[model samples]
Target chain A: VSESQLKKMVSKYKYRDLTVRETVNVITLYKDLKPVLDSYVFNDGSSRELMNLTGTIPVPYRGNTYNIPICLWLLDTYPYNPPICFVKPTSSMTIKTGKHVDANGKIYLPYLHEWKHPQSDLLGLIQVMIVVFGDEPPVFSRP
Target chain B: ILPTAPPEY
Candidate 1:
């Protein structure tokens, strides 16, 4: 079902949560954001380690693109409980918050704080990051 | 690499 339509599946959910639990199927929801994520970075099978989708945010800041990897911890009961995301440290990048992003790169958005089922997809979150990060992006430093 | 040090990419 994925790997082909995988991108489409991920893209579909990244923007629209498909409305609500009634309309949201976990399979479809999972597919929805997987593809959108592909554009940013590969998962590195990181999701299994943290129980959620994991990837790096390739954001452009100050004439440079930073590989700010992250961990998104998903709840066993989703579409009910929104995902919890964080900046996962790597040898390549360091933690530095910006705008709605905290020092730990923990996102603090009202949209996310009030996140409900069937809305506020991963793409939207990424978009917000793109906007807020602007030239600042994440506090990225090489090891 | 001028852009990145220790150029991982």
Candidate 2:
């Protein structure tokens, strides 16, 4: 999507009004990562939907680079609340539960837990994911 | 593993 389109989507964020800085931060993150901006539905016996970025983040592993698929969910109180993250495995791959990733591919990180505004942003969060996943990838090819 | 700063993309 074009920068104009991304700006429009970010402006139309449903839950809360993103500050100018927050909006710019989100846009910059998307620009750098090039994730597809789309809506994600959460079904908890009931349905709640929110905007999310779905795509892959590159990680340098050993001597190779792996583009690991991931989903980053922007909550109603984004920037203030860290985006919910997960490693999304394709049909050709299977999840590998590790210190930072659960069996279901839910991500757990110090970055997410101790998330503080100004210092913590989507780009920084993604950087952390890359570093952690590089140690032990969260998914493996199905054999 | 420790969370270190990843090299810039």
Candidate 3:
């Protein structure tokens, strides 16, 4: 079901086809995270249809675990390039700006800054994201 | 390349 969706999206996207390595890696990521995959159009209108992860991630904070909705955009040069991450706040939650997450919910982490191929992948990045978001919860219950 | 997860700190 979902697997076919990924394979189809990757093969027929407007952007160039993803390499075999990229394809395998993404499929593995989907298997592990089970997040929804979809296309995202950027502001520049330059289409990169083969990439985008939009779903909720689990975060443990202050003795509580929260499943925060987030979106991770893979650039065409993914694996070689860090993804653009954001916290997608829902109706009952408000974004909390801090060192790791900005006012717009864009996430910035040391792991992202120092990302390297063959040694960095979506699973690892998301693990770090959970930890960082734990240290400083990225969103709060709205009033 | 195969699908292998890597750690990133």
| Highest DockQ scorer | 1
Taking all chains together, the TM-score of candidate 2 against the true structure is: 0.75
User: Over the stretch A1-143, how does candidate 2's per-residue lDDT look in tens digits?
Assistant: 45455555566554344533454565565443443555466665644445577667667887777778787877766777888898877777778776788989899999999998778877688778878888878887665
Residue A115 error for model 2, in Å? 0.8
Query: lDDT (0-100) at residue A139 of candidate 1?
Result: 48
Worst 10 residues of 3 chain A by lDDT: A12-21
- Name the regions of candidate 3 deviating beyond 4 angstroms: A12-45, B1-9
- How do the residues A11-88 of candidate 3 rate in per-residue lDDT, one tens digit apiece? 544333333345456546544333345566779876555566665666776666677777787776666788889987
Who is ahead in lDDT, 1 or 3? 3
Compute the lDDT for candidate 1. 0.49
lDDT accuracy of residue A12 in candidate 2: 51
Clashes of 1: 7
Local error of candidate 3 at residue A16 (angstroms):
9.3
On the 0 to 100 scale, the lDDT of residue A138 in model 3 is 78
Model 2 chain A poorest ten-residue lDDT run: A14-23
Name the runs in model 2 displaced over 4 angstroms: A12-46, B1-9
Please provide TM-scores computed only on chain A for all of the candidate models, following their numbering. 0.54, 0.79, 0.77
lDDT (0-100) at residue A51 of candidate 1?
Answer: 32
TM-score of each: 0.52, 0.75, 0.73
